[PDB]
Design a protein around this ligand. Structure first.
Ligand SMILES: Nc1nc2c(ncn2[C@@H]2O[C@H](COP(=O)(O)OP(=O)(O)OP(=O)(O)O)[C@@H](O)[C@H]2O)c(=O)[nH]1
Ligand SMILES: Nc1nc2c(ncn2[C@@H]2O[C@H](COP(=O)(O)OP(=O)(O)OP(=O)(O)O)[C@@H](O)[C@H]2O)c(=O)[nH]1
Ligand SMILES: Nc1nc2c(ncn2[C@@H]2O[C@H](COP(=O)(O)OP(=O)(O)O)[C@@H](O)[C@H]2O)c(=O)[nH]1
Ligand SMILES: Nc1nc2c(ncn2[C@@H]2O[C@H](COP(=O)(O)OP(=O)(O)O)[C@@H](O)[C@H]2O)c(=O)[nH]1
Lengths: 50, 39, 47, 49, 432, 428, 428, 440
């Protein structure tokens, strides 16, 4: 939630600010890492209940 | 300056509370800070 | 008649800013309304 | 007079860019860091270990 | 019901009054007409069953002019056309003229008005008198007035804010004579004579407020901010509050030792303020510094007999408790032994009001009423001057003329002697 | 059925008992309007101690609010639990105490105690069995010490067989808010010696120190001190308000802490106290309660009990707890601290337990200490009194109101005559 | 159940014991936040030796955290295991150590020792039987010398029949972090001798030698230096925390290792140590353990046992092992090295074996040695003290805090009167 | 909690303090108008400015300093330039008539119109500090203000705050080159009056910085800007452990406990490490051994006195940045095995190590970016020759009473020169008596 809200918030700025800085790609990497955690944990819970 | 200290900083013995982000070697005299003299 | 019954209300409200302003230690001690103070400078300069 | 209007345009867009930069501080500082500061800790991400 | 008649007597009075009633009016939002554009105002304002709030004061000058400006000013409909009594001939810098000649033709109307404004008071706390010690009316009239008030309003306090003659500057030449003959009027007919002195305020304004060229307006506003703190507990609510009688109980040690000195703390100028925290510690320390006192006198040349720290704003007991401890551990501040606990504390809530002038908007502020023995200095300088002339018999002719025997002059000096001796032997360490 | 009439005098006593009424009303389940909104029948079981029934189930506190200035009445009526008192119990005067004991005791205080006595007589006669009175006041100042001791005296000869508990705020050496405070304190302690049955000496400094080293509050306010006073009041009146094993009311607290009729000045203590950041490190049980009680940091009087011998000690616990766990701790303190307890009173600790704990907690325990160390207060007040009295400093304001020299001298001498037995029992 | 009150003084002692609590909570399965998440029921069987139980299944370490600089407490609270200690146990004072024994022993140190003793008395009377105390400090410098030895004296006076282990970091010959190390060590050893029961001398020379020659670290720092001391701290107190065959606690080590009351200075060692490059070449067995224990490269003091006869040796093994190997190897060491052991104590080697090893390791062993070779450690300090004392160097502030020349002379004389017994018992 | 109050006397002191406070503001992040732009949210954090800067209502960090000069325009540069909003308007204190290279005018006639004002400001500054660790007094041994008013400040501060520590950072006159004709007079007079009132006095000679700026910084035409910036770096290193955290947190009382062996001997030599000018950072590895050896080299000293003609008593090494304990102890072992560095036989352990994890943040200018620095304070008896050269000059001028009429007619009596010379010679005799080896 924090990563998604921060990314959606930082997506808009003024015209001479909005860049692909050293913030946007770290937020995207955090979102991807959170996602991979999510499906890996789903799979691990499935093996656990099996 | 990138040092061995600044890599191992949240595990070093003599490092105070890292409340900020740039240098972990700031000073965070907030726990000591006697209760009558505290904000 | 509603006056005395509103005097209590008045106090209650005037005693709802204390539990906020005072509570913040960094306000009870060092306290300056930058805004009002800034004006006094500009006004004194105009004067 | 041409020089004066040239400096005047420079001041115009300088205040433009300053307001732009200040609202960038507002969106970076007041929104995102404050919403980030409630991040859960290592033990909670481990699952109450 | 905590009413307080304010008898302003003399040019000084009418002018210190102007500032005072302006701060008063804004403090309790009351337009210069007398119409609020809850009961925190009865101390100084009476309601004429219509919303009109008339001031509870009696401006009195044995000459017109000074008051006539207020009658044709912005505060013209506020004051009652009769509260402002004015005479028709100045007292010509002469205690005699203002006490035995031109004043005996205005005292009656003043006392009548005072009773008219002392009947609409359910519980008059005390009278506040603002006069100068070096003028005709200021000395003569206040003398006559305070004497007649003593025989009448006897069990009511009679505080006296005065402008003791300067210790170097001075504006008159007959000043010493008038100030020495008004001693047996602030020693045995007053309940707490807070004496201030222009020379000092000039410095307090030239070094703390940056006004390099102070006028009399930039001076009365300060005397007014001080009188507000000594009358706030009897107006706006607060924590540890302290009324008139209380200040006295915890300040006047013996009957003939009622000459406290005032000292407001946050006297900064919106500009040097940013570079200062302006906290209870600082405000407390200031009041206890010589270059901030309101009477050119070093409190280091004497022992504090008592002290009334009247705080006001966003101060908590915790802070006063601390600031007092630091002052109770400073080799400089030396207190008498016969006063162990020597700090009466008063914490109100309403912060200081700002009248478009100089002092900044301060969230916390403090006024101190201390009974130091370093007042003998001032009482001594003047006597030196009075003695330097009552030997060559200069100007004494005018007084005899306006009705007054030499005896008066002589006696006066002897009295101030007792006073000086007293306020100089009530400090010297004990022998047994 | 037993009941307590609550007197509160002066500004200090008024906010102290206002916090007391708040904490006991929200213990017993009465809202600000005055009705019962609770969850157990035990809250209504013993409500006839502090609450008189009125129409429509609207309980009114059995309190008399006394002041010489009509501003503290406005503050209390504007308080959160302000619309609960009877308005005829708001007795006040359009005058001033002036922080003067003489002006509170020999003047308009005596002119207004007739109305105060009328209201306390009607509230103490609309009864069937009275336990006593609980007066809260400041020992240094006016009204609470001026008219307060006079109220103590006259209610004492009107009701000689009922218990009188005076919660008094003793003055302070390091920081004092008033100047004539040793005069007020000495004069008031003169009547407090041989009028009341329980005295609770609650200094402000000890409350401030508990707010710093125990509670770790960076904002200690007057309400935070008055709540610490109020918790102790609830702890000493809880056993007659709620059931439990080994109940103890005011009288069998008194017969156990008063060995001789003049040694009834206590140092109180409420001690499940812990900070917000250190609460979750605690292990709140009977041993932690015992250590927190018996430490010389949770005393509410500014006297170190290590400088004297404990005459008697009462421990009134509240909560579901074992009995052996209480008795062995009350034993262990006496056995391990052998020089701090008097030898001629064997097992000088009284144990009382109530089942119902205070809200938000499970185990509490209040402490009543009759210590030899209370002589420090009286010797210190006597030292300041002698320092101001040898030169007649601030004495004309008393001789004018009507006192004279030998009453001050007799008050000082009676303070020494109270210091002498609390010296003799401290060294047998 | 037995328990140990842990104390740590100075920056050195605070950091070493912080790493010690890290190590022992790793052993007992305690997380940073204080709760338990492990794998065996043999970890909470004896958890009440170092952890006081709190509410909600939390285990707060029993440790008193003493320093005179208000930054080392902050660093300990912000460390890895910072949110595990009691905030009340963080006892300190806003002052300076000034690396001064006088400023730690006759000043604000003595003004803080009362609050420290209050905390210690809390943790020592929250007990049923206390085995003793475990103080960690450094002799060279302030606080750990001054506060450390003053605490040593008062705790020994209050509790006279409890075991007491002091892990002292003693000044190093080749490099010195502070100038006045010989002064502080000379003034501290005099208090160390006739107070404590087990003193462990850890030297930075031997710590760095284990880091270089044995472990082959690249950048060794204070975390690893204190980690090596936490090794022996965990190793000594293992038989009363985990089950074993032929258990031996603190007193049963002290009886077998202290033949005379003056001789209790030991040289610790922990010896399943190997470099990461030599890790895959190991043959981990009890003979290899004894081989690494009894060499003069693992022993944690800068004293060569080739220069003095072994008075007593103790070997506290930790792992599932055959007792036949242990007994025969401890006999084989004594038989193959005959001149390195005293003859008047036949079989001067003690054996203890615990079953549960340190976590993540198959098998460990700790070494403790009382030897003649503790000569040099006190001697070099004595000549350095004599050299700096003959010319009155760095002494005016020592006498400005309230000392005398005769106390310095007595400290040097008692250093020599410690050296002479370990001279004479090294020569039959 | 760890506050220290800096007061700067004279033109030398004021410009040194200007270069000091610029470095302090760049080290802590406070902008020239007194605003921290990195704590507007996630504030209530840092406390490292509390030894240098206070905190006021409008988020402003007022410096804990007093700039005093008996003559204006050197303070008017501060009140006009880029730091007019940083300092308080009353902390900057000026007279209206110059002391004019006269100790008599600085101490006896024009010091009394300002001593009470300076003491009032110092009193209020010390009042708004919980635990004061020391005063840092930045002045010179040259001009009349920086000698006489400094000595008056020592007397009054010893009266009022006699327990507190007073560190001096002072500009010594040149043994060879100099800039005035009364520098020996003022130097000997204020040496005599500050020997008994300074707890630790660090000495900075001008042509030593000229030589190390010519050699290490490659600046053939240096300026007082560079000189006071290097002094600023030295004092930022000495006040670094009461700013940040490290393995060896080493304090001002630690410095006093290791530098001085005896109360009179309180004059150390300061050296710094990397004076590199970024054309020299491509070729020096700048390891811990190199920065340790560059300190003990007799060419980077800031006083023109060769330590070969003297014996070291004790030295504090103050390491800053990427420094390892094994590297510092290897460097100390190498220094001890080196024979040219002699130590007194009555101090075997002559080193105190302080390690800080906060490397120096550079001013845009001369000095290069380095991960390592060390400030080496050595108490040595080799300063006796630097004393002796000004004694030769003072005797050479006082032989027939040149320039004495100004000092005498202004208000100072004649015997001051004789007693200053006698106390100076006694101090030197103490240096030889302490520096000789033990034979008993
Ligand atoms: N703030 C302020 N103070 C004033 C003003 N006018 C006079 N004073 C003070 O009053 C002193 C002189 O007042 P007086 O000499 O007593 O004047 P007076 O009361 O009218 O008496 P007469 O001269 O006889 O008319 C001066 O020294 C001032 O200190 C004023 O307008 N404003
Ligand atoms: N770093 C630095 N040193 C200076 C500066 N100005 C002077 N000095 C040194 O100080 C010595 C004399 O200067 P001061 O002692 O400050 O003279 P002063 O205090 O201004 O005395 P007056 O000229 O009478 O006002 C010279 O030898 C210089 O080496 C400066 O601006 N910066
Ligand atoms: N605990 C507590 N103490 C108070 C409170 N209000 C005042 N005090 C104390 O009461 C003392 C003075 O009260 P006092 O002058 O006697 O009030 P008075 O009885 O109306 O004259 C102060 O020193 C305060 O410390 C309160 O609300 N709670
Ligand atoms: N083992 C170990 N030793 C340390 C550590 N930190 C400091 N020391 C040693 O402690 C000694 C000095 O500490 P000291 O000055 O007494 O600290 P203080 O007690 O707070 O004054 C140095 O010689 C270091 O070798 C650490 O983290 N681990």
């Amino acid at each position: 939630s924090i990563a998604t809200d921060n990314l959606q918030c930082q997506e808009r700025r003024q015209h001479p600010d909005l860049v692909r800085d050293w913030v946007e790609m770290e937020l995207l990497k955090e979102a991807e890492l959170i996602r991979n955690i999510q499906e890996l944990l789903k799979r691990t819970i499935m093996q656990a209940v099996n | 300056p990138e040092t061995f200290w600044i890599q191992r900083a949240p595990q070093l013995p003599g490092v105070s509370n890292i409340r900020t982000l740039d240098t972990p070697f700031r000073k965070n005299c907030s726990f000591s800070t006697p209760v009558p003299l505290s904000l | 008649d509603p006056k005395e019954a509103a005097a209590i209300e008045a106090r209650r409200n005037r005693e709802k800013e204390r539990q906020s302003r005072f509570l913040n230690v960094r306000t009870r001690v060092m306290g300056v309304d930058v805004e009002a103070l800034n004006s006094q400078v500009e006004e004194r300069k105009l004067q | 007079e041409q020089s004066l209007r040239n400096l005047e345009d420079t001041r115009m867009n300088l205040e433009k860019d300053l307001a732009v930069k200040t609202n960038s501080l507002f969106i970076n500082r007041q929104k995102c860091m404050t919403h980030r500061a409630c991040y859960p800790t290592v033990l909670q991400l481990a699952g109450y270990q | 019901q905590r009413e307080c008649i304010s008898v302003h007597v003399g040019q000084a009075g009418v002018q210190i009054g102007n500032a005072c009633w302006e701060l008063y009016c804004l403090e309790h939002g009351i337009q210069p007409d007398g119409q609020m554009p809850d009961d925190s105002f009865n101390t100084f304002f009476s309601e004429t069953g219509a919303g009109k709030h008339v001031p509870r004061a009696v401006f009195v000058d044995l000459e017109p002019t000074v008051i006539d400006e207020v009658r044709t000013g912005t505060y013209r409909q506020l004051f009652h056309p009769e509260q402002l009594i004015t005479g028709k001939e100045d007292a010509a810098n002469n205690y005699a003229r203002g006490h035995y000649t031109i004043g005996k033709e205005l005292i009656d109307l003043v006392l009548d008005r005072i009773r008219k404004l002392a009947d609409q008071c359910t519980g008059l706390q005390g009278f506040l008198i603002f006069h100068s010690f070096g003028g005709g009316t200021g000395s003569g009239f206040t003398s006559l007035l305070m004497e007649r008030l003593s025989v009448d309003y006897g069990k009511k306090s009679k505080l006296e804010f005065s402008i003791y003659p300067a210790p170097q500057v001075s504006t008159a030449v007959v000043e010493p004579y008038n100030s020495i003959l008004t001693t047996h009027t602030t020693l045995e007919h007053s309940d707490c004579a807070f004496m201030v002195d222009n020379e000092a305020i000039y410095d307090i304004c030239r070094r703390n407020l940056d006004i390099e060229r102070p006028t009399y307006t930039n001076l009365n506003r300060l005397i007014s901010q001080i009188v507000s703190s000594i009358t706030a507990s009897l107006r706006f609510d607060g924590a540890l509050n302290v009324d008139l009688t209380e200040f006295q109980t915890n300040l006047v040690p013996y009957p003939r030792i009622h000459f406290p000195l005032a000292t407001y703390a946050p006297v900064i100028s919106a500009e040097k303020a940013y570079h200062e925290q302006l906290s209870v510690a600082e405000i407390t320390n200031a009041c206890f510094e010589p270059a901030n006192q309101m009477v050119k006198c070093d409190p280091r040349h004497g022992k504090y007999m008592a002290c009334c720290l009247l705080y006001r704003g966003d101060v908590v007991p915790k802070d006063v408790n601390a600031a007092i401890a630091a002052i109770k551990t400073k080799r400089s501040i030396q207190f008498v032994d016969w006063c162990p606990t020597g700090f009466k504390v008063g914490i109100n809530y309403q912060p200081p009001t700002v009248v478009p002038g100089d002092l900044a908007k301060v969230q916390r502020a403090v006024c101190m009423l201390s009974n130091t023995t370093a007042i003998a200095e001032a009482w001594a300088r003047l006597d030196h001057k009075f003695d330097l002339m009552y030997a060559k018999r200069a100007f004494v002719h005018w007084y005899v003329g306006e009705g007054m025997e030499e005896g008066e002059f002589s006696e006066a000096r002897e009295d101030m002697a007792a006073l000086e001796k007293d306020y100089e032997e009530v400090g010297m360490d004990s022998v047994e | 059925m037993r009941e307590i009439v609550h007197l509160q005098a002066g500004q200090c006593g008024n906010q102290i008992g206002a916090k007391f009424w708040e904490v006991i009303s929200d213990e017993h389940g009465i809202d600000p309007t005055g009705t019962y909104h609770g969850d157990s029948d035990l809250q209504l079981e013993r409500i006839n101690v502090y609450y008189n029934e009125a129409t429509g189930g609207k309980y009114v506190p059995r309190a008399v609010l006394v002041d010489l200035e009509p501003g503290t009445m406005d503050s209390v009526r504007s308080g959160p639990f302000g619309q609960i008192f009877r308005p005829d119990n708001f007795v006040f005067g359009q005058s001033g105490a002036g922080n003067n004991w003489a002006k509170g005791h020999y003047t308009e205080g005596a002119e207004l105690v007739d109305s105060v006595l009328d209201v306390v007589r009607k509230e103490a006669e609309s009864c069937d069995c009275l336990q006593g009175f609980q007066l809260t006041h400041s020992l240094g100042g006016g009204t609470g010490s001026g008219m307060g001791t006079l109220l103590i005296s006259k209610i004492r000869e009107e009701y000689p067989d009922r218990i009188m508990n005076t919660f008094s705020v003793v003055p302070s050496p390091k920081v004092s808010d008033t100047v004539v405070e040793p005069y007020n304190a000495t004069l008031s302690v003169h009547q407090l010696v041989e009028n009341t049955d329980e005295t609770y000496c609650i200094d402000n400094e000890a409350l401030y120190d508990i707010c710093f080293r125990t509670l770790k509050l960076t904002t200690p306010t007057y309400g935070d001190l008055n709540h610490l006073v109020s918790a102790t009041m609830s702890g000493v009146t809880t056993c007659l308000r709620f059931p439990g094993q080994l109940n103890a009311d005011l009288r069998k607290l008194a017969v156990n802490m008063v060995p001789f009729p003049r040694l009834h000045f206590f140092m109180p203590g409420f001690a499940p106290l812990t900070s917000r950041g250190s609460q979750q490190y605690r292990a709140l049980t009977v041993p932690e309660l015992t250590q927190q009680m018996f430490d010389a940091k949770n005393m509410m009087a500014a006297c170190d009990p290590r400088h004297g011998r404990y005459l008697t000690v009462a421990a009134v616990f509240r909560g579901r707890m074992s009995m052996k766990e209480v008795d062995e701790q009350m034993l262990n303190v006496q056995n391990k601290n052998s020089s701090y307890f008097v030898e001629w009173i064997p097992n000088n600790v009284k144990t009382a337990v109530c089942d119902i704990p205070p809200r938000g907690l499970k185990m509490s325990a209040t402490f009543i200490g009759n210590s030899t160390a209370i002589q420090e207060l009286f010797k210190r007040i006597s030292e300041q009194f002698t320092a101001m009295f040898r030169r007649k400093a601030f004495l004309h304001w008393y001789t004018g109101e009507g006192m004279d020299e030998m009453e001050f001298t007799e008050a000082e001498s009676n303070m020494n005559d109270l210091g002498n037995p609390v010296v003799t029992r401290g060294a047998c």
